């Protein structure tokens, strides 16, 4: 009952060619041309990329090609473009009438134009406050690459913080959000609160006050 094996991660640059391996056993990739490949962007269903080992469905970019040899299947992507940044899954028919997926490959496309984060900061809504609660929301978007550190300040002392892992917008860039949960009196106490976003060698900071 073991999956087809793929590399979990592949990091490559724009315009380069990449190849992703998928290894199985004689009961799947070996004896059948029942090998298909799927692409998945975040928050969306998988899409078929390659079927019958090497056939491309219409609509699919011809930069994508498939093959196999023995118990190993290969997916090749020529001229990496930013949109190719996705998860890729191997799949095969298996004797007995089952299908089995590969464990998955995450493809990172490196050499893209760097974008600095835009930061937008929201004080608690009035209606939330009426419900005896406070929550500051820091939204970060439009930054490439995808690594950020988010810090919170109260006046100027460092600070109930939860942050989302960055995510696909994803035309070119990423987005994330951080929340600072407060009791309304703690909101009423300090003169200001800040949201600090650290990206590459820049840090963009925003501030709100009661």
């Amino acid at each position: 009952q073991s999956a087809l094996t793929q590399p979990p991660s592949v990091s490559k640059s724009l315009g380069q060619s990449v190849t992703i391996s998928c290894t199985g056993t004689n009961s799947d990739i070996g004896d059948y041309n029942g090998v298909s490949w799927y692409q998945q962007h975040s928050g969306t269903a998988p899409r078929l990329l390659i079927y019958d080992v090497s056939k491309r469905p219409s609509g699919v970019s011809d930069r994508f090609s498939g093959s196999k040899s023995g118990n190993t299947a290969s997916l090749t992507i020529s001229g990496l473009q930013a949109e190719d940044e996705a998860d890729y899954y191997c799949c095969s028919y298996r004797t007995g009438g089952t299908y089995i997926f590969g464990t998955g490959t995450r493809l990172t496309v490196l050499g893209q134009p760097k974008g600095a984060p835009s930061v937008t900061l929201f004080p608690p809504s009035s209606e939330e406050l009426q419900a005896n609660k406070a929550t500051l929301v820091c939204l970060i978007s439009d930054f490439y690459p995808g690594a950020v550190t988010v810090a919170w300040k109260a006046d100027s002392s460092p600070v109930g913080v939860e942050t989302t892992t960055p995510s696909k917008q994803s035309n070119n860039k990423y987005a994330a959000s951080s929340y600072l949960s407060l009791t309304p009196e703690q909101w009423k106490s300090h003169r200001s609160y800040s949201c600090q976003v650290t990206h590459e060698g820049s840090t963009v900071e925003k501030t709100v006050a009661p």
Partner: protein, 210 residues
């Protein structure tokens, strides 16, 4: 082609759900059908397959004795009965149409959350205001929540962020739109928040700050 899923939501461990999928835009009774699942962390796992006539029926190892697949070729529907559920059955379940030993059309999927906790609808707060306005969808369980703006009429500048799991055990997310500042008085901005697992739907009007 459409594959519209239904069923899902929260279920206590040990319990049972029926999922169904309704199919259009292709001759349903000429194709084999499958269900495939995906836990929040990891990859695609093929779950089940039913032949064209419904006479042959195949199951993945980790699902046998518990899942039943069926289809109805007069009503173009497919169904997965999932029983004796454990927390590890928590996943997105896609129905998938077969081409020929591959899967060329996928449904968007339904999320099954297996937990001993109970259902809780969202509280929807406005983040009031190029300006950015948004909605803070707070303290719901389980996932998922969908968000549209102005009944899906408004598309540009929309980014709904991933949810955040708080130490409370509840989720919270926000949706943001970027709008030309020049329209804060003329256009109406309404966020529509669907939380199907609680049968709650909430529309919030966002207006500029006092």
């Amino acid at each position: 082609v459409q594959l519209v899923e239904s069923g899902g939501g929260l279920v206590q461990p040990g319990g049972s759900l029926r999922l169904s999928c309704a199919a259009s835009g292709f001759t349903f009774s000429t194709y084999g059908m499958s269900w495939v699942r995906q836990a929040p962390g990891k990859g695609l796992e093929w779950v089940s397959y039913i032949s064209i006539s419904g006479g042959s029926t195949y199951y993945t190892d980790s699902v046998k004795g518990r899942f039943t697949i069926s289809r109805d070729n007069s009503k173009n529907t497919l169904s997965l009965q999932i029983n004796s559920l454990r927390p590890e059955d928590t996943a997105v379940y896609y129905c998938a149409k077969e081409g020929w030993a591959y899967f060329d059309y996928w449904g968007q999927g339904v999320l099954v959350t297996v937990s001993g906790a109970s259902t809780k609808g969202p509280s929807v707060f406005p983040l009031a205001p190029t300006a950015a306005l948004g909605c803070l969808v707070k303290d719901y369980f389980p996932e998922p929540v969908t968000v549209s703006w102005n009944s899906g009429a408004l598309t540009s500048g929309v980014h709904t962020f991933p949810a955040v799991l708080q130490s409370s055990g509840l989720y919270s997310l926000s949706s943001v739109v970027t709008v030309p500042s020049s329209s804060l008085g003329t256009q109406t901005y309404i966020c529509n928040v669907n939380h199907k697992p609680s049968n709650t739907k909430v529309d919030k009007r966002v207006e500029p700050k006092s």
